[PDB]
Structure formats: structure tokens, C-alpha cells
Subunit: 489 residues, 4 copies
């Protein structure tokens, strides 16, 4: 796949930040590098945000929230800006998908069809909410008029990760912008290009200066400055369960609202009456989609004993057949992990699996000459206390376990600190709904897997998070409820 | 003294766990006082870490299986409504308990606290059958719906200023969602909650649905917040403890809803009805002896009327009749504890020494009891301690201003934003100001109003989330999105 | 073995039965009375004061006045809720009295009136008492120059007419939702069954309802019903009854541009696909039609059976039909009572004849039962086609029609070809086929692997000619509200 | 000073104007035509194809077909949303063309058609496009044994009829909400003004609306309008127009138990209390009636003034009436156009004569204006009383009645003493009295210190004989919906 003229032009220069409407370098001129994970080459050199640039972005956001066009503008006008942004993202679909395949590592075609169209659709959907963020009129007594106002919190601080970079930026900004908030967003050090290219689309659509501010860099500096900034009203984060604790601890000094989307160890359960063909594909896609770098991956495939052998065999074959290559290569089905660090983490989870007694039915090592690749892996002969079955691996690594009863599979699926999503496969109308009701997960797919949509909320139970993104529900994280009483005698 | 409260005070006060009245496993007890007399009112079983582990087991169990978990929403509603009736039937008993244990006048405990508690459980009983999720039209290939499921076991800690009512703010919404509870009342006021336990058993709550565990903050309180099986935590009290509660909740990605301190403004604009505004400004701070998170402790008054309102507030400050809550003539009681009286008396000294002048009060009252005279500070600056910090006593600070843009900025220049009041006869100016103030609830030409139906909570460091109204149900809910492939 | 008359019902039945206007128990201004019967024995059960137009007029005046001013206009939402809740406690307390009056006046079995009817009505009032404090409007963010908000105001005086089949629960369907909004009421029960309601009047009084909030005016359709439909001062109207009278109401209401809510009949289909848990569907098919002697608007009067199962289902429906114990609602052994009236008995017997004349075979039942009383035998019709009078028209008796089908697309099309569409039942164990079929059926309520379920929190009503609007749930409240949009210039 | 005709509107008028059925532009099957005029000049503006009853069957078949299968039935909600949004972009692209048609065909000033009408129609479609993805039903927790959910199903083929006063925006009020639900439409524009909507039809083709989702049928009320109202296959009817035709529609709709929506006339009151900002209120009172030449259902045709200010506002309204610049809508100087037709001019001139016959005084206007065209002078009536025809009936021209009043309780009695209740205006600087008076007024929209504000997000509709239901806001969606309650037994 050849590089688009516009990405070629964008990559031929240092990548600048976006603060108060202008593209800029860091105040002290620091820069960092982002890699193409298929080759290990440098892809771009990016301006690095420091504590001081984060202060400059927060000021810009604060000033755009209080005075200015963003603050005076009608709800209909604001909706139009957000919808114009989506048209532009759609105009630039090929450019964004190329950037995403190159910087993050996923196959071009799926970044075009899944990521880019999902981010488009999410802004279209949230553009419609600006005019519909309603409060209440509460009849209490004829002596008062009681109403509530859902006022945007103000300046929000957002940090997203590297696995679905552009789409993850829309999960945080669609809802936030629709309430009328102002943003200071930090992309992952591994994948800042998509959003920095998107920056020019926020300007072209007509976003007023400072409404949106993009700051690439590192957690120890740019991330920390976001979470600790005194003039940031609310914070939102997606990433590892470990950092969400830190962010929630640091947010306690200001009593700041928090939204957290974290890891999982989600189950995909195949009961006796499942349509096995559809469920084997679901289990396989469930873990292998996006190389398993998906918090909601169906990393624990539970299979009723009657079908266990059949699905272990089918999933091994599928695993051995996946096609590894660079994301810009047209016949690639799975790319590599995003970084040397990640490859080393997941490979180590594999060793850990091995030496704790489990077996490698497929994969279980690196792949190819260069790049951060890992062969799709299938672990068999597994136990519930094993590290590979309790902990999020973040790679194309599945663990398959047999069970004998429905009561049993429900108890084992729930026996986790995580609770993000789950899958249940059965043709029965009663057991599909019964099983989904008892599972302690934020999303449940009956006879399918890995589905998201701007309109249906997403988030975890337990240590998989606090709050929800997508749908009407995400609006509430960016709002502050005011209850007005008007005495009328 | 009512016979049922006499019988209740005649024995050590037991905790309520898994449907039963029990003593602490380790046998410890603590004393609760009567703040008018300084005497011990009762000895109470003291909950240790291991009593909290027993309450949580009982809670966990009642939620996972059994009647509470199997009950229709109409059946749950009936139980909650029946509790409301029982609290109403025992209104005089609970009112006396509140007055004796907290300190507040009997009649206000009866007319406000008990009726508000009853109203709250009737309101929330009404929501059990009405907590709906959505059906989302997305695609003909799927059926998309959300369930609003209860979180599970909740940990609740409440303060001493409005002991019974706050047990309802917390429990009514949680119980309506089908949650199970572990609640610790304040050590200064454990009595009314523990007497109300009787009424949960008599209404028919199955065992373990509710568990009352009194004790101290660094033992029972920390046991709740650090407990591995508590699914969600809610707290009302100081902003300094709230930080601790959120820090510790972080270890387990536990949801938190917090109601905390304030330093709310009560603004008298030039076109206000001055007679109504003076009374509102005075009730605003002096209600419940200023032991109220939402108290209007900063009275801003347009320069044109500053001196008029100071005279009136001084007059009214000295007219307040101080005495024990159990005496009929009493308008204001004492402060809850010795520690509190020292605290507010020490805030008064800090104000004199910073250069403010005490136009009324500013010292203790009477021979015994933790009483402080209603106090009015003048010649104050925004810079002073007495004007930034929550005093939590019957102390008001009166501040002249010259313009509407100035007052808005000075009101908002705070770390707090729980509540605010604005007094103005003008339609436009009333809503413009209301919109502009960074505060959870704004009252236009009124002050201190609460209702089960209207959300309450703070912006900034006054809190996270809201209690009361429909809004409160969300804190006790875990949202599940279900996708059913029908293609 | 007769169920013994309750002392308070004998006291009640001993006097002439009065109307309830402006808080007082009154006779008709003209002094006219009519008779109500016991459809099991045909005796006169009670003498009831009969409302004329003049009486309806005084009901409206009392209603108007309780709405515009006084305690009910001034009460807080909590106070109103408490009233509604107290009313439900009192209905629960008089449960036996009320269930006997239902058994006695309507004819249905006492135990089912107790367990179902009465407790549904208690529970419907408790549900709605809970809405009172929660009927919320919107705050709409349009622009920084205005404060935009809505008010969901009560319409005012509401004219309500209910039928005879579920007398007390049908009273609660109408009044719970309307009273919750803060509306005022003029209610008319069916000439066949006025007693459940006029007894319940004691309890509205004992609960502390202010005068004129609630007004019960029994009588006949051509006088009292029409006076309500036509009153210049009635703000909104709600009706349940024949699809023929629904039209008259909706036609008259045109003159005053009055909002109308209608609940009317059906020919609801009960579909048993191949993958049904058959034992269950057979019990649902039988109860779907036989419950309440088929005097149910949502009766699954058309039982569609996939061909594999048709013979099995017919055999079972026949045997069950023939085993039903017919008797008086007040006898303990009774499983099914009589039809409400002589007129109704003549209507269904006649529909049965039309059935035989058109070619269908009567597999069970098909005639009157017992020596006296308005009884009809549970009836099963086979050898039926979609064009027959009996499969198209509502019979309103314990009469079922059983039809084989050979594919799902076929049964959906045949189920849907009706001017009715009140309810539907589908029996299948498949997760996809269940919801697919439920989505394709044109009905207001679809039950999947069940039938005849109602609950206060779940809307009910028809598509096509089975009605307009919905009752129960949050949805019912909108019928009694007038949305007001207020704009406040804030410069 | 003439506004130059846009070349695309010149091309469009150069030809016979076709109707729009099943995505194609067609003539009437019978070949009939009628003429629409320019009310400023009285010449024929265009010849338009006249839809007969046969043409309404064709429109309905195509709508029916587009609702049951094909892309419109298959489409995801994000896809339907995207069609509605693309439409809004195209209307905005053609803003000048559409505003000129409005000005030429209806009579109103170009600049106001542009700024108000066109911009509001674009914004209404944008708002409703946002609703397609967010139209949700409920999941109701009743018991562990069932899963209870509801679906908001589109009703199906909807018949729509709109008037001539705000032609395009009224087309969007009706279609935005109906399309958002997933309905299929058959829409009759008024005989006096079909141009706007038949031109916009080009933009529905170009946005990619599937064949038959939208069908535009122009003609006369007694042929095409009647054919829509009486068509057996239309599932729902919506109408904006005269109180009299609203009665006819409801009466006819009874026959099929078809839901109705009615946006009818008014006689709205505009109240200036003793404490109003008199500057702003005089302008409000004036704009309140004269906007769109008084051809507005919600016009403040009754301006009530506290006695203290009566003379000051009479004097100001008279000075402002005598100053309105009457002229063609396509001339730049123009502040007020002509009435829409000969017939409408006679009707308002007649009401003015009825006013003088009953004893009222003309303080300004009261007669025709200019050489040709259908103009009437802005008119101000005084010395008027409540029982007069002019203060009671909707005139529908630039004719106001000013009434003094002495107390607040008094003016609320007199404003509410009307069969109308569409809107109302209240001017007072006091926070308390502002809401108190808004609370007590029986009108669907109350503007506190403003008048004539409509937004896509705020509901609009009348109380009493001013209508049934609401349009705009979330509330309009329910008129195009059918509620289905699904119960899934889960043991
Ligand atoms: Na990279
Ligand atoms: Na105490
Ligand atoms: Na009878
Ligand atoms: Na014309």
C-alpha cells in the first residue's frame, strides 16, 4: 500500500502539538520518537509536551470555556461544529487509517473499516446530543419551581491509550464536547500521529481556539501534569488497572470526578446448545481481534465438556493459520504488538504459563525477522489460579477451559477482579438471558462478540472501571447537576 | 421521656447484624453523651474490624441469595413503604432520641428530621418499580438493551449533624435499587439509627439486607472503606476525611459518592425584599446551630443595605433562646461535643486576632453543655481564615459588595460549592446569578430547602455525585449493555 | 359448599346503592334506580341509584371545583402520594369484601377475584402513588439567552368509562394514572357491575380524598355514558369497551378537540411454533382463552399451531375444556363462572351457531350449561379458515379457534391480518426466533413463552383498531397531562 | 429596489410543476393542473399538477412499500440519520432559492423567509437527525422471572397536511419527527403554496432518500386532503390548519381508530403587567401580532395592558402600525407583505367590518392598501369588549385588539376565557409573578418577556380547541410511535 501524499507530507516534518488553535512545538523544544512496530524504524519525531505545555493547554481550555465563541454559541451551532468534524474525518479516512496502521501496527483495511468509520459515527452520534442534554422540572409543591441544569464541568483532562488510538480519542471527546466542555487530551507515546493529524481537521471544521488541545508525551511528565493540574475540573482515563488506581488516588486531593476504563479478563462461554460453527469463529475473533490488544478480549474461552476437544482443535488450526505481516501489507491479517516492551511482556506471560503447568497447543513464541510480533497462542490444560488465567496479557493469547454445568461456569466467569465484558453462546432463549443476567460484566453479547456502537454504553464492573463511555450514559460524566429552587411565594 | 426510649436507654446499645441485635464480638463498648448536660446517655456496643467483616458477610449473603434477591420490585417497594410507616408511628421516640443524642430542639427534630426521613423512604419506595434501563435502536440485526443492576454490598458512613435523615439519604436510594447495606453512624450520635433497626426487623426486611455498625472512624470506618468485599462506598462528613476515603477506594476501583463541607454564599442584591432576605440569611446560618454543610456562612449584602442587615442579624443573634433540646422553649441547642465547641470557639479567637470584629456572640453560653452564642462577624476580608474555612457552628460573616459581577466572583472564589442563595425580586437577574454560581443547589429567594425529589450535592471540593432525586439511584447502579444477535 | 357472605357486604347489599359525588353518598336527583344481577342465579343482587345527565353535570361541577381550588389543588406531591397509598392499604384491608362483590356482581370465581383482581388493583394504586412525586418535565438547553422548560400539567376534569369484565382493576387502570398527575375524576362503571366500585367509594372517603376529586356515577350508556362523552366542561376522556362504541366516543370528542384514550378489543393470536416446550404452550393456549370465561379483550382466541403439533394440541384443548368445573363464583369448587349477562350469553351462543353454519366443527362445548345462570361451555373450534366470522370477529366468550400453519412467515402474515392488534403470544425455545417473531407481530403486548400477563409498570394497549394510547406504566401518565413549554428571556 | 430572481428558481418556474411519488417526478394520472399565484401582483406564478384521489393511492402504495421492505426498512439508524442530515445540508445550500419561492408564492418578505423560515427548517432537520439514534424504549424491572422491554416502533405510513402560512418549516415540523422514527410519508402542501416543497423534493432525491419514503401531493382539501384523511392504509394522520377542519379530520379518523395530531388556531393573549419593561413589551406586543402579517396561529391578537400603561401602548402601537412598509416580498424595502389570497383578504376585511358594526374603534388601518395585491393595513382596534366577535375569533391578519385591565387575577380570568389556548405572553420584571402567571395560563407555550419564539428542541401545541398533541422537541416523536411491550418468560 503506498503512502498517501498527505501522510508523506505530514511525516516529512516534525510533528507538532496543538494548543490554543495553533500547531506548535514544545516551549523548551524537547522531542521524542514514535516507531512503526512492523520494522522497528523511526516513523516520526514528535514534539514532547512538558509540565509547562500542559499548563499552556489548560489556560487555553479555561479561557475558551469562559469567554469566547464556545461559551456563547447555541447548542445547535455546537452540534454543527461536531458534525463538520466527522465529515472531515470521513474525507481523510485513507490518511487516518494509514497513520493508524503505521504507528500502532494494525492492518490498514481494518483501521479503515472499523476504527475510522467508528470514530466518524461516534461524532455524528454525539453531535445530536448537544441539543438534547436535558434536565428536570420537578413537581414538589405549588410554592416553588424546581429545576435542574446539567452544566458542563469545564476543562477536562483526558488520557487514552495506544490500542485503538483515534477511536479512543472520540470516546472521550464526543461526549465531553457535546456537554460543552473544554479539552486537554494526551495520546499514548506509542501512537500520537492519528490524533495530531486529526488536529488540522478540528481547525478546519471551525473549532474556536483552545476548545481542544492535544499533547503528546510520556506519563511521568505530561500525564502526571494532567492528573495533578489544579485548574482541571474532571479527569478521564483508559489504560491498565494499575494506573487507574494512581489516577484515582491523585484525583482525591481535589475531590475531582473520575471516569476509568480499564483491563479485563473477559469470558466467552460456549454452552452445550450453542451453534458451534458461529461460536468457534466468535471465540477466535474474540481474542485475536486487534492482536488481543483490547481490554475486552475474550481471553478465557469456556467450553462445555461435550465440545471442548472440538473447539480446542478448531482454535489451534485457526491460530496457526493467521497471517502475520506489516499493517500496510495488503494480505496481512494480524500485525505486531505495539512496542518492544509489550512483546517482552506478553512473551513473558507465555513463559509464566509454561512453567506453572499449562501447555502450549499453538504459537507460544515470537515470529518473523523483525518487528514486535507474537504468534497467536492457545493455552490448554489450565487452572483457575494460574497467572495466565487471572491476569490481562494484552496479546493474542487465549486460554481454553472445560466446564460441566451452567452454575459452575457462571461462578468461574465471575471469579475475577475484572468485569468488563462477556460472551455467551446458546440457542436457548431462556438460558441466554439467564446467563447474561447473572454475569458480572458491563457488556454482554448473546451469540456474538466484540461489538461496540456509539449508542450502547461500555464500561466495567469491579476493577474493570468506574463509569461508562458511549451512549447517553457517557454524557453524565461531563456534567455537573445544579438544582435550582425558585420561591414563588 | 417516652416509655419505649426509656426501655431502650436502660440496657447497653446493641449493633444490628444479619437481622439480629448483637454485641461486639470482642465485647468493647463506647459512650455517647447528651450535649446539654455532658452526661453519658448510653453505653453502646463498639464495632471492631471483625464486626464489619461479619456485617459484610451477612450483606453479601442477603444480596446473592434469598428473599431480597428473589423479591419482585413491588414486594421490595412494600417493605420500604412499611418502614416509612413504622418510622412515622415512632416519630416521638426518634425525635427525643435525636434531641438527646445530637442536641437539637425536640420540635424541629420532630417537624423536620423525622418527617423528612419518612418522606425520603416513601419517595424511594416509589422508585423500586421505576428504575428502568433502555432499549436502543441501532440495527435490525440486534436487540440492544441496558439493565440498571444493583452494585451489591454498599458501605455507608454518615455524620452526626442530621443523624436519622442521613441514614435515609443513604439507604433509601441504595435499598430501592436492590442493594444490600453496611452502615456506620457517627460515634457522637449512634442512638436514633440503632433504635430504628427495630423497625427494619418489624417491617420484614430479610436478614442481612441492612447492618448497623456503630463505633469509631479509624476502626469501623476504615474497615468499611478498606474492605475487599464492599462494592461501592458513600460518605458524608469533612473534606479532609473525604480525601482519605477516595484515596483508599482507589486501591479497588471502588465508586465513591461524597457529600462534604461548604462555605456557601447567601447573596442579598439591591432589589431583594429585604425583610424576607434578612430572615433567610439568619436561618441560613443558624439553623441546626450552624452544624450544616450547606449553611450560608458567607452573607454578601449590597452596600446600600449592609448596615441594615448587620443590625438585624445582631438583634436576632442575641434573641436566640439557648437551652437543652428537651426543653420546650429552646430555639438552639448546644454543639454536639466538647471537641466541636473547642473548635468553633477557637475559630472565633482566630477571627478576632486576624482583625475581624464580633458584632454579636463570640463566646460560650450557660453553665454546662457545649454551647456557643450565635455569632456575627463584621469587618472581614476574603483573605481571612474565618471566611475561607468551614467553622461548622452558629457563626456568620457579613460582607459588603458593590456590583453583581464582583459578588459572583467572590462567591465562586472558593474550593467549596455545595450551595448558594440569591435574593432579588428581578426575574432575569435571579436566573443569571443562579446560572453563574458554582454550586450544587441554588435557592432564589429562599434558603436551606431539601426534598427527596430534588438532587443535592457539591461542585469542586464539596463533593462527588448527588444524593436525593432520581440522580441518586445512579450511584447505586451498575449499567449492563446486552446485545442479542437476532440476525 | 358456598363461600359465606361477608358481614360488610350484606350490610351494603341491604340498602339501595348510592352514587358518590362531591364526597357524599347520594341518590340520583331524579330518584331513578336500576337493577344489577347475580349472573350465576339471575336474581336481583342490588338496587342502584341511576345517574342521569343532571347527575353527571353535578359530578363535573364537583370535579371542576376540586381541581381549580381547595386541598387537592394545594397539596404537595408527597401529600397526594400518601392519599393514593392509603387508598391501596384500605383496598387490601377490604380485600374479601371486594372479591365477593366481584364474584357476585360480575360472576367470576371468588378466589381468582381475590388473588388476581383485588391484588392487581392494590398494586396498581401503589405503583402510581409512586409516580406522583416523579412526573417530570424538561430543561432544554437551546441558547444562553433563555431558560427553556416544560411543565407536565394535569389536563383537569377527566371523563372515564370502564367495562364490566374486570370491574375494580379496570377502575384502577383509569384512576391511578390520572390521580397521580393531579387530575380530577368523573367515573362511570358498567351497568352490569357497579358494586365493586361503589363499595370502594367508602375507602376513598376513609383515605381522606378531598371532595369532588373522584366521582362515581353508575348507570346506562345512552344517558350517563353519553352525558360524559358530550360534557362541554370535561377536558379529556378515556374509554374501554366495544370497538363500535370507541368510534362514537372518538367522533363526539372531535367537536371539542378533546384528547381520547381507547382500549378496545382483539383477536389476539397465540402461536405455537415447532420448537415450543409443548406442555407449557398447551397450558398457555388453554389459559390464554379460558381465563375470565374468555371475557378478556386480549384473550388469545386464535391459537395457531404448527402442523406437527396441531392434533396433539386439539386433543388436549378438548379434554381440558370438558374438564372445567362450571358453577357459581361463590361456590368453592368453581373454576369458571357464567357470562355476565343474558345479552352476552345470547351473543356468544350465536357466534357459535354462525361457527357451525359456516362449516367449522365444534370439537367441544358449543352450548349453554346448567339449569340457571348465564353459563356457556368452554368451546373448541376446529376445521376453521381465516375468512370465517368466528376467526375474524371478537366473540368475548370461552370460545377458541385452532388453526394449523406450515411456516413462520405464513403464521406472522395470518396473525397480522386483522383489524385488531391488542396482544400476541409466541411459544418457541429459540433465542432468535422468539424476538424476531415478537418484532414482526403487530400487537401492543407480546408474550414469549407466556400469555395474559399484566403489571402496573408495563404499558398495555392496541395497535390498529384495538385502540389509541396506552395504559399502565409511565406511558399512561402522558394521557393525563398537558405539556407546557415556558421560555424565560434572561436577556 | 427588486431582488433578482435566482436562476435555479427561474428554471423551476419555467415549467409545469410536478408532484413527487416513489422517488420520481410525475404528473397527475388524470393530467389535471391548478394554479398558484403571487399574492403581491395577483398574476399566475405557476401551474402545478393537481393530485386526485387516484394519486393518493399511488403515493400510499409507494410509502407502504418503502416502509415494509427495501433500504428504508433495512437501514441502520446511523444511516437514516445520515440521510436526514444530508437533506439539511442541501436545503441550506439552496437557502436563497427556497426563500425566494416562499416570498413569491406565500407573499412574505425574502429576508425574513431566509433568516427565519429556511434557517429554522434546516435546524429542525438537523435536530431530528440527531434523534434517530436516540429513540429509546425501556427495560422495566418487574420480577426475576421475566425480562420486560418496550420498543418504540414507527407507526408506518403517515398522512400529513400542512398550511400556507409557513410552508417549508411546517413541512419540516411534520417530516423531521416522523422520519426520525422511521416512518414513511405522504404530505399535501396547501393549494396556495406548493412551490417550496416541490422544489425541496429535488433535495430529497439528491440526499439519497429511498423511493417512496417521502411523497408530495399537491392539490385541494376536498380531493387530495380528503383522500389522505379517508385512506384505509394510512396508519396515522397529522394536521395543521383550521379548527374547523381539525374537527372533520378527527371525525373521519374515528372510523379507523387512527391516531390524530392537531395543531389548530388560537387567539393568544399577550399581557403587559404594571411592572414590565415597557420598552421591550411594546415591541413584543407589536411584533407578536404583526410577524408574518398576522398569519400565525400563535399571534398575540389580544394585547392586554395594565390600565396605567394602556394609553402609552395604544399610542405606540398606532404609531408603529402606520409606519409598516407594505410592499412585495421580493422588494427590499418591504417590512410586510400581502395576505395570501383574495379569499383571505376578504375574510380579514370582513372581520374588520364586523368590528366596527359591534362598536369597536379603528385607531389605525382597517382597510385595504396599495393598488394591486392582497394587502391589508396593519390594524389596531380599541374600545373593545370580551364578548365581541373580533376579540373572540381568529381573524388571521395583521389585526390587534388592545384591552385594558386592572388586576392580575382579572387578566388571567380573561386570557383563559377562551376556547383557544395555543400560546401566551407575559411581561413583568418580577421573578415571582413571572412564573406564577405562566403557571396559571392555559396555553401550550408561555413566553415570559418575549413572544413568537419557536425552536426545534421546544414543544409546541395547544390546550383546549387549539389542538391535540405536540410538535417539536422530544415530544413529537411519540405521535409517530407505537409502543410494544415484550415480556420474555425466563422461567
Ligand atoms: Na508508533
Ligand atoms: Na450523643
Ligand atoms: Na351484576
Ligand atoms: Na401562491
Amino acid at each position: 500500500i503506498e503512502l498517501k501524499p498527505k501522510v508523506e507530507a505530514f511525516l516529512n516534518e516534525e510533528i507538532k502539538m496543538f494548543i490554543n488553535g495553533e500547531f506548535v512545538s514544545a516551549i523548551g523544544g524537547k522531542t521524542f520518537e514514535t516507531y512503526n512496530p512492523a520494522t522497528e524504524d523511526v516513523l516520526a519525531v514528535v514534539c514532547e509536551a512538558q509540565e509547562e505545555d500542559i499548563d499552556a493547554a489548560v489556560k487555553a481550555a479555561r479561557s475558551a470555556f469562559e469567554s469566547g465563541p464556545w461559551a456563547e454559541m447555541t447548542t445547535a451551532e455546537r452540534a454543527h461544529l461536531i458534525y463538520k468534524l466527522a465529515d472531515l474525518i470521513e474525507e481523510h479516512r485513507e490518511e487516518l487509517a494509514q497513520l493508524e496502521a503505521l504507528d500502532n501496527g494494525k492492518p490498514y483495511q481494518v483501521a479503515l473499516d472499523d476504527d475510522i468509520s467508528a470514530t466518524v459515527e461516534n461524532y455524528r452520534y454525539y453531535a445530536g446530543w448537544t441539543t438534547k442534554i436535558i434536565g428536570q422540572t420537578i413537581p414538589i409543591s405549588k410554592d416553588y419551581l424546581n429545576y435542574t441544569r446539567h452544566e458542563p464541568v469545564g476543562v477536562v483532562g483526558q488520557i487514552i491509550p495506544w490500542n485503538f488510538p483515534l477511536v479512543m480519542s472520540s470516546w472521550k471527546m464526543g461526549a465531553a464536547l457535546a456537554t460543552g466542555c473544554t479539552i486537554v487530551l494526551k495520546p499514548a507515546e506509542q501512537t500520537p500521529l492519528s490524533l495530531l493529524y486529526a488536529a488540522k481537521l478540528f481547525k478546519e471544521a471551525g473549532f474556536p481556539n483552545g476548545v481542544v488541545n492535544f499533547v503528546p508525551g510520556f506519563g511521568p511528565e505530561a500525564g502526571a501534569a494532567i492528573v495533578n493540574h489544579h485548574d482541571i475540573d474532571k479527569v478521564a482515563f483508559t489504560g491498565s488497572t494499575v494506573t487507574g488506581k494512581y489516577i484515582m488516588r491523585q484525583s482525591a486531593e481535589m475531590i475531582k470526578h473520575v471516569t476509568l476504563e480499564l483491563g479485563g479478563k473477559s469470558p466467552n462461554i460456549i454452552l452445550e446448545d450453542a451453534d458451534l460453527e458461529e461460536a468457534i469463529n466468535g471465540a477466535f475473533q474474540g481474542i485475536m481481534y486487534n492482536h488481543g490488544q483490547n481490554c475486552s478480549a475474550g481471553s478465557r474461552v469456556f467450553v462445555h465438556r461435550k465440545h471442548y476437544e472440538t473447539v480446542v482443535d478448531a482454535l489451534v488450526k485457526m491460530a496457526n493459520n493467521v497471517k502475520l505481516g506489516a499493517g500496510m501489507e495488503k494480505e496481512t491479517e494480524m500485525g505486531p504488538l505495539v512496542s518492544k516492551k509489550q512483546q517482552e511482556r506478553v512473551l513473558n506471560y507465555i513463559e509464566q504459563g509454561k512453567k506453572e503447568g499449562a501447555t502450549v497447543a499453538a504459537g507460544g513464541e515470537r515470529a518473523l525477522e523483525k518487528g514486535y510480533f507474537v504468534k497467536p497462542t492457545v493455552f490448554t490444560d489450565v487452572t483457575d489460579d494460574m497467572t495466565i488465567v487471572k491476569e490481562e496479557i494484552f496479546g493474542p493469547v487465549v486460554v481454553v477451559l472445560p466446564f460441566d454445568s451452567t452454575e459452575e461456569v457462571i461462578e468461574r466467569a465471575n471469579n475475577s477482579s475484572y468485569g468488563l465484558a462477556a460472551g455467551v453462546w446458546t440457542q436457548n432463549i431462556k438460558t441466554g438471558h439467564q446467563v447474561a443476567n447473572k454475569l458480572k460484566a458491563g457488556t454482554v453479547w448473546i451469540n456474538d462478540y466484540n461489538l461496540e456502537n456509539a449508542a450502547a454504553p461500555f464500561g466495567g464492573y469491579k476493577q474493570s472501571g468506574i463509569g461508562r463511555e458511549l451512549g447517553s450514559y457517557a454524557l453524565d460524566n461531563y456534567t455537573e447537576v445544579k438544582s435550582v429552587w425558585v420561591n414563588i411565594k
